[PDB]
């Protein structure tokens, strides 16, 4: 039933029912308060007077007449002020004449809408008829002019919106605008082709180079899934090239439940694609790019854990600024085969390998490695011991030798090390408010016979990073060619402060120094934290009878609140290679750097982010940054400007500037240069849906 609270109603039985005096229509679930009403039983309609303040489930509508039809719910109001609500989000609209077509279809003419609340609305998209539909989430908006502030900032004769959470094909995903050498701008045009695959062409300009066409594809199937990013630009204006490009590829394939086959690819045109129009992380993992292919295996499920994979790799190394590249080797085949099983207590670990390194500036030559190790373990209740008996067996075959390099070699180096150390636990030397103090000693002793293996070339071996964990490794040169001959007794002691209620580490110490069969060095470290604030991380690498110190480092970082961070970090070291001089001998010099970071709200509504990486060896900062973010009531601003002046070459500095604009419930967050100072939590609106939100209901 639909009861009316009006005391007096002019009507005989059915033809007309006229009610006045702030009447109501029950219609369970939809209140309807108005001023007066008239009926006429000809099309079963309802007119709701002059004020018409409806309110049903969070959408207060205030119109003029609202001539409903109520047979298929065809309504027609005036001056509607629609404010729909929903869990987490909302919309506001001031239309001139709302319509209604059947169910879930509107024709809302002459609007002025925003996702913001009432008042001097910071922004709104005034327009003509907006035919929002529910069967298709495509709300056309004829003659829409995006206003901001008090002046229109845009204009179109036709526009669409994704009215729900679907994958909107054909939407031009926003824009990216920011630069120094020009005003380099790019506008992507995503256009979905099928549920599985969707290429996104993005035309662009650089303002100083030319025009780019960086687009990408991204497919998917039951088994094969991959992406294919790329870029290309015709004749350049500042450098002089004409056809530069870049390509990427993933294609993670599956054959049958055991064999993957992934193709990791990356290739640029010249030795200067990065460092020209790329970010500040071109420093690492971008001096030599990757190109791979691999397979796999695994199982046998019966006293075995086989694995394999025939990798084929050939890096692409870039020059720095004048054409000086190192160009490491290239692995054409690689027939790895690992193993692992357990004999109850003992633990057999076997291996194998094969690799042909092809090169031009240096000699080629296949090889082979068999490392059948066996490591028993014994931990009774307190302290562990674990011996081991391996047998390293290399065998080279190098051809086209230019100088002196034995045509065929072969070695066997029986590796025998005995790792094991006890453990102590104590509660009497605690420092805090109820912590538990653990002190733990341990040892190591590895025996490896000696040989003369310096006439064999250095294909892939490299000396390992000397730290605390280094004392407990059975190979200094962490590779395969050079295996040192050692007879040492690394001695260590490490202490962990563990909480009195749970077992979260609060602080960890340690120190160790490997003997010989003496000292030649010292290694200490300490890293912990009293929680969120007063975090600390340090290290050292001392050597006595020779000099003061090799490579000490220090750290810090205190968080007063969820933001307000002030992280800082030092780093020292002598004889550190810098910039790869002409011949190939790296410039050797001593480091002294101190990077400072912060993100400290300067004003109730303005935050700041700052980075600064100083270098005392030359009295010039390596990298520096400065930003500023904003917020308001309707996400009116959500504006962030970020400026960075990094270094690219030995001398070539190159600055840049960035912009970011955010509106409530229609934007996106994530477009940042790289992973900067630790947290850098954004200081503006979530902005999930990126357009038109998700809900539309009467």
């Amino acid at each position: 039933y639909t009861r009316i609270v009006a005391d007096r109603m002019e009507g005989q039985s059915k033809v007309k029912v006229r009610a006045e005096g702030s009447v109501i229509i029950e219609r369970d679930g939809a209140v309807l308060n108005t001023d007066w009403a008239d009926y006429d039983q000809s099309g079963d309609t309802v007119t709701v007077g002059d004020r018409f303040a409806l309110q049903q489930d969070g959408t207060l509508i205030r119109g003029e007449t609202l001539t409903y039809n109520l047979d298929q719910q065809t309504g027609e109001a005036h001056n509607v002020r629609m404010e729909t609500e929903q869990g987490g989000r909302r919309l506001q609209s001031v239309s001139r004449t709302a319509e209604m077509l059947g169910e879930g279809r509107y024709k809302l003419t002459e609007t002025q809408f925003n996702t913001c609340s009432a008042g001097d609305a910071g922004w709104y998209v005034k327009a003509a008829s907006v035919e929002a539909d529910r069967g298709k989430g495509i709300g056309v908006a004829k003659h829409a002019a995006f206003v901001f502030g008090g002046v229109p900032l845009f204009y179109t004769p036709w526009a669409d919106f994704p009215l729900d959470g679907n994958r909107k094909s054909g939407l031009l995903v926003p824009s990216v605008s920011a630069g120094s050498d020009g005003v380099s701008l790019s506008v992507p045009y995503y256009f979905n082709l099928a549920p599985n695959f969707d290429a996104t062409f993005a035309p662009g300009i650089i303002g100083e180079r030319g025009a780019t066409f960086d687009g990408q594809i991204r497919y998917l199937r039951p088994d094969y899934s991959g992406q294919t990013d790329l870029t290309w630009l015709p004749h350049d204006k500042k450098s002089g090239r004409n056809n530069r490009y870049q390509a990427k590829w993933q294609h993670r394939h599956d054959i049958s439940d055991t064999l993957q086959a992934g193709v990791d690819f990356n290739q640029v045109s010249d030795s200067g694609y990065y460092r020209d129009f790329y970010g500040g992380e071109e420093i690492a993992g971008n001096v030599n790019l990757n190109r791979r292919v691999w397979l796999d295996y695994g199982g046998r499920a019966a006293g075995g854990s086989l694995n394999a994979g025939l990798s084929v790799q050939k890096y692409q190394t870039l020059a720095n600024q004048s054409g000086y590249k190192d160009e490491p080797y290239a692995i054409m085949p690689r027939l790895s085969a690992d193993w692992h099983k357990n004999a109850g207590r003992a633990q057999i670990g076997v291996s194998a390998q094969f690799t042909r390194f092809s090169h031009d500036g240096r000699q080629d030559g296949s090889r082979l490695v068999v490392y059948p190790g066996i490591k028993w373990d014994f931990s009774n209740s307190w302290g562990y011991v674990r011996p081991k008996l391996g047998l390293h067996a290399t065998y080279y075959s190098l051809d086209s030798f230019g100088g002196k390099a034995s045509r065929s070699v072969g070695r066997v180096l029986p590796v025998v090390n005995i790792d094991g150390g006890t453990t102590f636990e104590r509660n009497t030397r605690l420092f805090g408010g109820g912590v538990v103090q653990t002190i733990e000693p341990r040892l190591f002793y590895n025996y490896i016979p000696a040989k003369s293996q310096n006439d064999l070339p250095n294909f892939d071996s490299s000396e390992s990073s000397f730290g605390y964990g280094q004392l407990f490794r059975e190979n200094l040169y962490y590779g395969n060619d050079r295996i040192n001959a050692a007879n040492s007794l690394s001695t260590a002691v490490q202490s962990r402060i563990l909480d009195g209620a749970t077992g979260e580490e609060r602080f960890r110490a340690g120190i160790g120094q490997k003997f010989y069969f003496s000292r030649s060095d010292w290694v200490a470290f300490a890293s912990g934290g009293i929680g969120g604030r007063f975090t600390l991380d340090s290290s050292i690498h001392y050597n006595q009878n020779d000099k003061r110190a090799e490579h000490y480092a220090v750290g810090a970082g205190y968080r007063p609140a969820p933001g307000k961070v002030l992280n800082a970090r030092y780093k020292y070291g002598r004889n550190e290679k810098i910039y790869l001089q002409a011949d190939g001998s790296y410039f050797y010099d001593k480091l002294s750097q101190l990077d400072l970071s912060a993100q400290w709200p300067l004003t109730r509504n303005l935050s700041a982010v700052v980075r600064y990486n100083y270098g005392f060896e030359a009295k010039k900062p390596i990298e520096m940054l400065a930003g500023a973010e904003y917020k308001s009531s309707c996400g009116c601003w959500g504006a962030g400007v970020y400026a960075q002046r990094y270094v690219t070459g030995e001398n070539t500095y190159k600055n840049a500037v960035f912009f970011s604009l955010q509106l409530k419930d229609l934007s996106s967050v994530g477009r940042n240069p790289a992973g900067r100072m630790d947290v850098a939590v954004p200081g503006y609106i979530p902005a999930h849906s990126l357009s038109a939100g998700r809900n539309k209901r009467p």
């Epitope: 002409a582 060896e617 009295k619 010039k620 900062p621 002046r645 030995e650």
Partner: nanobody, 119 residues
């Protein structure tokens, strides 16, 4: 910081001269050095530059074969050796260094020297 040059004076066309740029106030051992010149009443043009170790050099295409730039990281001084001089060689030479500030954005020009080769 401060840079001062030396060695200006009058020499006939076909003469020789080596100007010195005694730099001080900062770690010269790590920065490029740019030698510039500005004829009296004309536009300031580029002459030559030196690398950090003196290993690499760039010369202006108009000054090739007649000039050679050298540097010395023991007195923070660089030298520009000139031979087979001509009437058009006369200018005011400036020692210039770039990106040496707290922000790596400053430049500094010396007081300059006067080299006049007459007709």
């Amino acid at each position: 910081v401060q840079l001062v040059e030396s060695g200006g004076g009058l020499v006939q066309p076909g003469g020789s001269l080596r100007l010195s740029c005694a730099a001080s106030g900062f770690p010269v051992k790590y920065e490029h050095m740019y030698w510039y010149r500005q004829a009296p009443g004309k536009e300031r043009e580029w002459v030559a530059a030196i690398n950090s170790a003196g290993n690499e050099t760039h010369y202006a295409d108009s000054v090739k074969g007649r000039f050679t730039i050298s540097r010395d990281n023991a007195k923070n001084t660089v030298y520009l050796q000139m031979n087979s001089l001509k009437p058009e060689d006369t200018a005011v030479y400036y020692c210039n260094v770039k990106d040496i500030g707290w922000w790596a954005a400053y430049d500094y020009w010396g007081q300059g020297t006067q080299v006049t080769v007459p007709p």
